[PDB]
Amino acid sequence: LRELRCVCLQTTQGVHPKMISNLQVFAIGPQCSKVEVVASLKNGKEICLDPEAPFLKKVIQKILDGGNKEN
Amino acid sequence: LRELRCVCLQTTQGVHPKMISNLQVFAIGPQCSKVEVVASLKNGKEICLDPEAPFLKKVIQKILDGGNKEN
C-alpha cells in the first residue's frame, strides 16, 4: 500500500467492433476510482478506451447487444 | 487443433449486480461458436451466466447503467 496506477494510463480513439472480440470491464478499485473499459482484438492485442467519448459507447454497445442475438 | 471446450461449460442463476464488479464478453472463437458472458465477483470468484435467460439480461443490464453513471 504505497503507489498503484490505474489499469489504463492512456486512451484510444477507434474504430469498428469488427476488430474487437473480448471486452473486459472493471469497476472502482483500490488503484483507480474511475471506470475504464478495456478491449482485446481478434489478433491478440489489448487497448484502453475513454468512456468520455460518445463513439466509444457505440462500439461497446454493439458488442453488448449483439452478444445476445446469436444463440 | 484437435479438441477445444467452450470457456463456459456450465451456467448459473443469480442474483444482484451488487456482487458483480467485473464483466467479460467473449465472442466466437475456435473453442466456442456461441457468445458467452462471464463475470467476476468482488470476493475473487468467476462464474458463467446463460444469456438465454431473461433475468440474466437484467442483472447484466444494470452493470452497464450503473457502470457509466459515476463521473
Curated annotation (Swiss-Prot), chains A, B:
Transmembrane segment boundaries: none
Residues annotated as site: Cleavage: L1, R2
Annotated disulfide bonds: C6-C32, C8-C48
The protein's name in its UniProt record: ENA-78(8-78)
Organism of this sequence: Homo sapiens
Shown part of the complete sequence: 44 to 114 of 114
